[PDB]
Amino acid sequence: TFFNPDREGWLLKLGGRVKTWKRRWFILTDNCLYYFEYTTDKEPRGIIPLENLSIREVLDPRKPNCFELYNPSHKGQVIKACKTEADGRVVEGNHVVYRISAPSPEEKEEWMKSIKASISRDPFYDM
Numbered sequence: 001t002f003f004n005p006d007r008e009g010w011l012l013k014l015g016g017r018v019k020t021w022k023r024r025w026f027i028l029t030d031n032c033l034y035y036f037e038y039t040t041d042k043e044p045r046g047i048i049p050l051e052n053l054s055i056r057e058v059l060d061p062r063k064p065n066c067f068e069l070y071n072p073s074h075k076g077q078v079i080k081a082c083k084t085e086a087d088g089r090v091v092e093g094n095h096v097v098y099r100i101s102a103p104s105p106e107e108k109e110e111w112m113k114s115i116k117a118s119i120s121r122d123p124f125y126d127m
């Protein structure tokens, strides 16, 4: 699944119910954003399918180079996603938005472009 990735790199992500920022290694592939706690981890911490989502730039009080993934068709609608819990649970995400912070302005632009291209490339886009 992780072979032939569209982009890989470190990004800071804001939590769902609990609003805490975590540094995660992201992998964009198969029109999904997989994230890992550590780069060499065998298992992803979570997966965010990009189908039906949009991206928009945002300004954050503390974190620079931010953007958000959100569902444009249904405001306030929880984004379909799946992640693991320390106790072993595999559960659905609780995010209405995914606020992400990139390491640099350039990396923000590259990530936003890669994600948008992935979403548009999907043959089942807007269906």
Ligand SMILES: O=P(O)(O)O[C@H]1[C@H](O)[C@@H](OP(=O)(O)O)[C@H](OP(=O)(O)O)[C@@H](OP(=O)(O)O)[C@H]1O
Pocket (backbone or CB within 6 Å): 013, 014, 015, 016, 017, 018, 019, 020, 021, 022, 024, 045, 046, 083, 084, 093, 094, 095
């Ligand atoms: O560690 P604490 O301070 O509790 O914060 C956690 C982490 O930010 C998790 O991120 P990660 O999974 O990358 O570790 C996040 O899961 P998401 O991955 O869904 O953002 C949790 O979201 P909730 O389960 O919605 O609270 C949030 O509670």
